[PDB]
Amino acid sequence: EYIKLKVIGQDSSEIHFKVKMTTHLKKLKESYCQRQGVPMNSLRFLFEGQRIADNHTPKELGMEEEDVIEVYQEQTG
């Protein structure tokens, strides 16, 4: 089955995905980065503060319908 997921940036922009619950979120990270035209390695995807690994699933992380993934950009100082 599919799961709807909101991917939200710090400007409050939302990209809505409908992905399989058993699929690696790496595919979603790639799609989001191409959407925004930035390198994937310069973004960080968090679910309730936890870093989302490439090999993670919505199912393994306990995501439910319309849950939110927060995105942050690389920070240097």
Partner 1 sequence: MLDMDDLATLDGQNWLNDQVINMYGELIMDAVPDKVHFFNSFFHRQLVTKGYNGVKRWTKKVDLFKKSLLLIPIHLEVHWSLITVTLSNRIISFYDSQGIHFKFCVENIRKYLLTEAREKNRPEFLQGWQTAVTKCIPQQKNDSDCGVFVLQYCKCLALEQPFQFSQEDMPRVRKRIYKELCECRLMD
Which of these segments, 14-22, 28-36, 38-46, binds partner 1 (CB under 8 A)? 38-46
| Interface with partner 1, residue 76, by CB under 8 A | yes
Q: How far is Cα 39 from Cα 55, in angstroms, rounded to an integer?
A: 18
The bridge status of strand 2-8 relative to strand 14-20 is: antiparallel
Q: CB burial class (10 A; 0-12, 13-18, 19+) of residue 44?
A: middle
Total of residues contacting partner 1 (CB under 8 A): 13
Q: Which of 20, 35, 48, 60 binds partner 1 (CB under 8 A)?
A: 48
Residue 55 binds partner 1, judged by CB under 8 A: no
Q: Which residues bind partner 1 (CB under 8 A)?
A: 10, 41, 44, 46, 48-49, 51, 70, 72, 74-77
